[PDB]
Amino acid sequence: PRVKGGTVTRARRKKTIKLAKGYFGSKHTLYKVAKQQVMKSGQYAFRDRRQRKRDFRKLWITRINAAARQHEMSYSRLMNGLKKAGIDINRKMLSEIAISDEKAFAQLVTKAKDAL
Template sequence: MVFTTAVNFVRSRGPDEFWRKRKVFKLAAAYIGRSRNCYSIAIRSVHRALVYATKGRKLKKEDFSNLWDTRITAGCEQHDINYHVFKESLARNNILLNRNTLATLACWEPFTFKALTDIAHKRASEDGITPPKENKVLYIPKRGSQSKN
């Protein structure tokens, strides 16, 4: 192919239209309605899906992190200890199990988790570790409470 100008070269670059579109259609194969067969609609939903997939990988980690916390908290409540007191006591005892492991133990190894809470109880009572105070709203401005100067 002979290009007389650079503009023509730029315009004609890239794979053939069929192959270019086929990449997108392959990703959109399982979509519903026109977003599966109609390129201009398919490309939109494919792009959106890819962005979601990228963001989702990060969200998945956050979700699991929250799930571990929930599981440890549930296990702690079973043994009458506050989550923060539990974590602090373990840290002071130099028991460096991470939250993932603690959650696993809380789920699948109840006796081991009981042993850990026992240790935490002991340490907390020795050191006087108290649960952190809940956030309290100290001042709520009411209508007319602020004086005009």
């Protein structure tokens, strides 16, 4: 028996195009260039899930550095002091504390300085 091309092709291509929704011009319209872009999007997203952890740790560290400097202490010495004090609060929590309640952060800074 003969199997004509049928509907599968259009269904598959339409799925790719819908995933290409929002893209510029032909890239949200034509299957070949949409497919290519969706491939690039997948590769980029896989890479960027990992890069995002780097990025947010970097941000937290920058903010902690700024807070420590406000307390006359470098980021490096503050982290060394917290380690020697046995305090395991991670960078994200430290940043959020520094932002939200400065007195708590000042007490942590004094704990670090005492440990050093």
